[PDB]
Amino acid sequence: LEMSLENVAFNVVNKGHFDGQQGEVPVSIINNTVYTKVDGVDVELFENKTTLPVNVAFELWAKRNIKPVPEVKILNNLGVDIAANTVIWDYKRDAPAHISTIGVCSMTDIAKKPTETICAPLTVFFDGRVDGQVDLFRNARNGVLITEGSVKGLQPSVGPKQASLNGVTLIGEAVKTQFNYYKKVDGVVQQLPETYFTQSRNLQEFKPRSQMEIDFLELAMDEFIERYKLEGYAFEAIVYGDFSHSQLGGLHLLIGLAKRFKESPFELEDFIPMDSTVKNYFITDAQTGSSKCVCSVIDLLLDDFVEIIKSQDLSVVSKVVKVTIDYTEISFMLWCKDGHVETFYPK
Amino acid sequence: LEMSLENVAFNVVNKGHFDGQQGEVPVSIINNTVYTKVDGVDVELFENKTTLPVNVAFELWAKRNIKPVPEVKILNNLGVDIAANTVIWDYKRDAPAHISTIGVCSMTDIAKKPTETICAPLTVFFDGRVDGQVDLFRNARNGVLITEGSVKGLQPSVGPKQASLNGVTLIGEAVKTQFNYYKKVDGVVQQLPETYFTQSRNLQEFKPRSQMEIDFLELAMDEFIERYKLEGYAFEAIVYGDFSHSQLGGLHLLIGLAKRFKESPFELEDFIPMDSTVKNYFITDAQTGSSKCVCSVIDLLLDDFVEIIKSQDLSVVSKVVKVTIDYTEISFMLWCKDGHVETFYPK
Amino acid sequence: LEMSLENVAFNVVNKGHFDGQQGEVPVSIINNTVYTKVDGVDVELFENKTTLPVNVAFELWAKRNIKPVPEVKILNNLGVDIAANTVIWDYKRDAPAHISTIGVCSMTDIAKKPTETICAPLTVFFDGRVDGQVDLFRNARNGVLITEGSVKGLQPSVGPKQASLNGVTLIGEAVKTQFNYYKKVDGVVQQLPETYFTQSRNLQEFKPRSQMEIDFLELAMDEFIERYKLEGYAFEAIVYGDFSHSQLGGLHLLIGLAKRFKESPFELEDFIPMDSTVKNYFITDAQTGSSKCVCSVIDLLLDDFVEIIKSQDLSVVSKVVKVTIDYTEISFMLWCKDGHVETFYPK
Amino acid sequence: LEMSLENVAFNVVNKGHFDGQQGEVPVSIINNTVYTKVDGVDVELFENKTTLPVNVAFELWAKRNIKPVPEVKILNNLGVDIAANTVIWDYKRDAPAHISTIGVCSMTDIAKKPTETICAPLTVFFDGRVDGQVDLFRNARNGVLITEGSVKGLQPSVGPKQASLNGVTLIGEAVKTQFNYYKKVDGVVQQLPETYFTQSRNLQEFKPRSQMEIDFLELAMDEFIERYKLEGYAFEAIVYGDFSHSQLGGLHLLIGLAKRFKESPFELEDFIPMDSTVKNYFITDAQTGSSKCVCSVIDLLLDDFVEIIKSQDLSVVSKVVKVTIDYTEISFMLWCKDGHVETFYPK
Amino acid sequence: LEMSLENVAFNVVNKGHFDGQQGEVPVSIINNTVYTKVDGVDVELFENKTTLPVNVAFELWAKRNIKPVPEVKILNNLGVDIAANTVIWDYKRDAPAHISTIGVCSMTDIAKKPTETICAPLTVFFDGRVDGQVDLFRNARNGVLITEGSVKGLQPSVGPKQASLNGVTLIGEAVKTQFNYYKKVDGVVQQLPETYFTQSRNLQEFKPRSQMEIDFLELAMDEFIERYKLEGYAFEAIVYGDFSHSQLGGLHLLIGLAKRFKESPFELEDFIPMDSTVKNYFITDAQTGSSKCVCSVIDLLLDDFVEIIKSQDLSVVSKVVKVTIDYTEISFMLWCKDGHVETFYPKLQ
RNA sequence: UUUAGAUUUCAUCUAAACGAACAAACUA
RNA sequence: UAGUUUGUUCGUUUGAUGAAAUCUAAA
């Protein structure tokens, strides 16, 4: 089976997600909110933050994938346009990551199976943990596959260590969060390039993942630079920041932002609330009064960033560096002066 | 069975009202409107003019009664608070006639059967045209019953000649619209008084229903007054009106309003758009510029009104008159001078 | 008193407009609508079509002026900014004519009396029918005054015969709809120019107001021109219209449109629904299939238009003619060829 | 170009439709309504009756086609999924007839030109009146083309004599409303079948288009049957209607409905307000009390319907008839007895 | 009296709630929000989160009860349908706790006094700290009464120590928050069953209320089990939790969630956001990746839960155990092998 | 018509075991 | 081809809940 509003709310009340049970409950739809009648009074079940209708969004939210799914930025960078027989929820913007669906909700479905002729020119996302999806990927034209194990005849591309589980990004211990990504374009199995993966952390809950990051969050600016021989790579401005002018200087890695927030809190106005490899913020340091309207921030592994920046040439006045990060190319604006770097920030 | 939004919408799309079939259709709920996707584009099915939530009101409208039911004013004067296993629609305000239901909608249900203890202090409306409802009325504590035929052991009260059929009031020819009303209060079958019934007409679609009304619409004022010996009863101002001052005079029967409308169109602003025995309108005569803010109109049969007014006494300066109209008492303000009438407007 | 939502709704329920009575009724504000509970069910009182809040517009509409008031276009052309101690409802757009009030509603009041200093750089509209406003007008700095009679020391200007009474524009018989307009700017009593007045009619209820208009709606085009010696003034195209090409020609008077609508109905799309001396319509003729996007239509009296067009000189190729209509200058684009007129349409 | 809400509203205010000029006006968006500030007060320009956002719907409504375009149902039957560089407005449901656009609005555009790769698996509607579109139709894969004249190398199909102009269905006299339809499928020029075209009339504005229709609207039932020898085809119930029982019988042509409406008005509750070759109405006769929930009505030409029905065989108990009407197959359920007919309702 | 949106907003602006003062202010209603104009600009007074009209919900919210009142779960469990001459606000869902009112709001009133015949088949909640409300309880047919002290001729039932003061549950010191509950059904006084009371705590502000809870938050799992002789009662799973497999095991007491949260924060999704004895959560362990779609959590005192689980019979394969908590029966599902408990989890919701 | 009890069938249950099937990881 | 771990599905163990149906008893 029954595709209806009240069965979905039944499953939400009784199981927390649309599991497929049978039964119905009272439902009220007022404004963009879905209420239900429990003990004679109306309890809100879902408030619609999306641009879909209320019941469409409520049904999509209830049928969201509760397994560990890849982060939305990885799926966007791989070019995924639609997901086969599942809804992938974007908790950053409280909406589905993809506009249409395949065999999920009648209002959004462009097909009931990924093998129809309308899904052919679209990179479908196939979940190899679900039985029967690997063969669909094999017969598909454009698609992306993730698998915990190995698939015969296909060279795996090992993905990021972390994945989103119910909106929480974690490196799984009780569950596998590291999948092998296979991408097929026009019936030709492409090999994904060797990439770096961003760590997906945040300022408040920042935990270092390497001894170098521990040294960064622990040692002083001079001690850390001297210890790792980072002289002449402008780490004082690239990572630590410059809180002395009216405009904030540098600070284009999340680890430096976390260190500053530990020293003195500030304000990050994420004026585009979406998940991506490179984020822009509106920072305003509350102590010095130094603010910058746009600050491009990418949360690489500090060891990986060191490896990248030490593999460059400080010979030209400026150079744009192409690096594959999260299965996509990121262009870095390098401005290296004679023997030093004036600035090096993502664009 | 299934009670859900999409089954209701399937029934509405396929049959125009909820019949009880099985099936579902895609449905969008935006603002107070229910849309369905037909041929790939969204077609509006219902716009909520009520104060209920959209899906509640949509279900109630889908499950409205399609058989000829008594007019809402008759039920209100009979004190009906709720209906048994049916929904009665007030087409004047595009909202259900009663606040709660019995065994129709999960959200508005106070009970599933009219014999539950919660329904005992409520005058339920039983429809004798449906089987088993007469036995429910006998087993009810407080209830009102209508019957096309006769019920054993109960004294009928002959109701009005017309009934409402999908918002169209008519005197049914192919179908019966004259019902016998039975009322029971605290388990005691009470006999309703002898009453006069309002004809429930309008100005634009006005048709006379007696010889006297035909004379009124055709003969002049003096000819009509002389022919029916209506001298000494202020029929010039009470019925025809006075379009000579800045404030309109009299005009308290729908027949004279219709005569004027045939003479000259004007404006009737019904500031309380609901069905009742006595209606107040904001008249603005577009020809003479005479407007009256509040003007009570009661659409009686002219013969019955003549009988009532000739059953009066022209002795006192003023008197309040009690007339049972539509199973309820109507208070008439009669300002009559010595042997003549100054004015006569319902209160 | 008491200024409250429930008292306003009490007056609307009991009298149709805010009369100043004392009392309160239950009210519910859902969407942009105000509902009141009568006989246990909610009856809608006011649906908000304006851009004000619901209670604000409900209070303004209840306190609207129900006497014969000047039409909105006359007050606009006179530069009226606000009305003193009254609310003038613009029924064309179902919203107040003026953005603020003086001593009406706390949410819009810029003052409680028109004598305050904030009202000084504003043309306030004073109603001479309300006692005391003429003295206020004399003491005012900028203002407009209407008087049924005469005001000592001020030369009256005769306004149009018709006036708006509850949204119905009428020439009063039992009420006076003709006023004397006075204007004062910077404390200086200005004299209004001699003007022609548009009759403010419509196609559907079009009634001629002179013998010349009677002949127009009766005689043929060639007979009418010959009888009134309208040869050489392009009355075939200016007035009657040219339903022959894909683009409609001329038809810049309401009387010709009314003649055609009597001959054959069409569609007038008023894409700027507001009261103005010159109206632009989107004509689409349903018989000939000729549609014009913008067709400026001015509802002059036919005799006055003839008096206008016979005061012209048919010598220049093109001319912009200034005619003061409704207290404002209206620019006519006149194209006249050798001895004739090519076109003559309002700008 | 400039693509902005203010430029669109400037074009709408100055010209009534988006012509392509330059300028901006103040704009407000409250609820689903767009207002503009004319003379200091807000004037509503557009009320969104669609499911799209307000500004998207406003931009589409402004950019609608104001030339005579084919009726919507023809485009649906031909399988049109999108229109190239134009917007076709479905005035029955006050929304665009196609969900996406090409080169119109950035919010709905799936492509900027109809030649992109995403447009290939879609039947694009090309108008030959716009220069350069025939070359596009030749190189398109799936498409439909209309032309006033003829195209070299393509065999035309003569279209219906009526085309919709600004929501007015008319037979063009000053302009051409008859196009030649060319349809291509998968790069292959398909030939459209010979079809009978519905007239698209209405009850109130019903005008006969043949002498037979004149006789139907003038002669009585028996006289019309006798004159045209329509015995043995059950024209008494098929067209004239059966207002004798509680349920309406037959009445599946618009001509009989119009005749009855002339005799006595009734209700047409169009529960699905959209344009199609066959329409269903919820009829409730106000005079006799006869109401039918579903009544499938097709407005064929009476001569064409006579030609079709006299080509049938009255020898079977039941039969399904495939009649190509408006470029689509219509199934007719003919329950005819031995020389008589039980019922004949289109499906 | 005056009953109007402008007088109500005047009281809100001047005094915070509805005190019954006289006066008015300019009020604007846009969306589900009530705005008031202070110094030429509009200020948001109240955003409507309910299913009621904005002005109705604003009038109810203004006239809410500011004294310590019982938590809404206690009133639901005792069966209260309506409140006499007061509004009980549900801060867990920002809406009135009861559908209709008695003598409060003309739009929601079913009666102006609880003695009318429409209030007879409803358990009207009667306060005792408002004079004359006890005698209304005695004349009532169905109702619930609370009292700080004693009522002559009635047997008190001592209720929970905590009460909700303006949405803050607290064991009062300056103001008394322990009431005596009296229930009356069909005109007959009913003795309430002896119950345990959930402590109404939360994860972030968790404070132990007994020595056993201090030991639980301080000691290790094995040390605690050995000290309190809880071997064989599945305390490793029922209370502590089992973050080893893909689906979370156990963790049915709020104190265990508190210990885990202090060790390592996780996510609770309240997919039915209301107030009840047993809460269902969508727990996702942010550390191990362990999750559970429905995880029934009850906030009993640890000593009381130990007392409950030590009085079960560990013989049957399974048994549904009915425990009276907050004046209602809570069904605990008991699975136990021979001499050891497999699991014991609440089920409600 | 209302209520209580008994019986048949279906779905569910925040634990485990068993058997089956599929897939991945370790191994022979 | 076989043993162990993990994930998905089906059925059994144990008590109960809700629904559809049947019968009995009481008012």
Author numbering:
A (entry chain C), B (entry chain E), C (entry chain D), D (entry chain F): -1 to 345
E (entry chain A): -1 to 347
Give verbatim lines from the article.
However, these structures are potentially limited by the presence of multiple equivalent U targets in the dsRNA substrate, which introduces heterogeneity in the dsRNA density outside of the flipped U. This heterogeneity can be difficult to resolve via data processing alone, potentially resulting in the averaging of local structural features around multiple Us into a single position in the map. By utilizing a dsRNA substrate containing one highly preferred unpaired U (same as in Fig. 2) and a catalytically inactive Nsp15 mutant (H235A), we were able to circumvent these challenges and build a sequence-defined model of Nsp15-bound dsRNA via cryo-EM. Our final map has a resolution of 3.24 Å, with many regions reaching a local resolution of 3.0 Å. Nsp15 makes close contact with the dsRNA via a number of amino acid residues in the endoU domain of protomer P1, with a few supporting contacts in protomers P2 and P4, in agreement with previous structures that show dsRNA engages with a particular groove formed by three protomers of Nsp158,44. In the active site of protomer P1, K290 (one of three catalytic residues) and S294 (responsible for discriminating U from other nucleotides) are within H-bonding distance of the flipped U. H250 (another catalytic residue) is poised next to the 2′-OH of the flipped U. In our structure, the third catalytic residue H235 has been mutated to an alanine to prevent cleavage from proceeding. Y343 uses its aromatic ring to stabilize the flipped U while using its hydroxyl group to form a weak H-bond with the 2′OH of the residue 5′ of the U (C13). W333 is intercalated into the dsRNA helix, stacking with the base 3′ of the flipped U (A15) and the closest complimentary base (U-21), which is in agreement with previously published structures. Hydrophobic residues are clustered around the edge of the endoU domain, forming a plug that shields the hydrophobic core of the dsRNA around the flipped base from solvent. Our sequence-defined atomic model shows that most interactions between Nsp15 and the dsRNA are mediated by the phosphate backbone and are not base-specific.
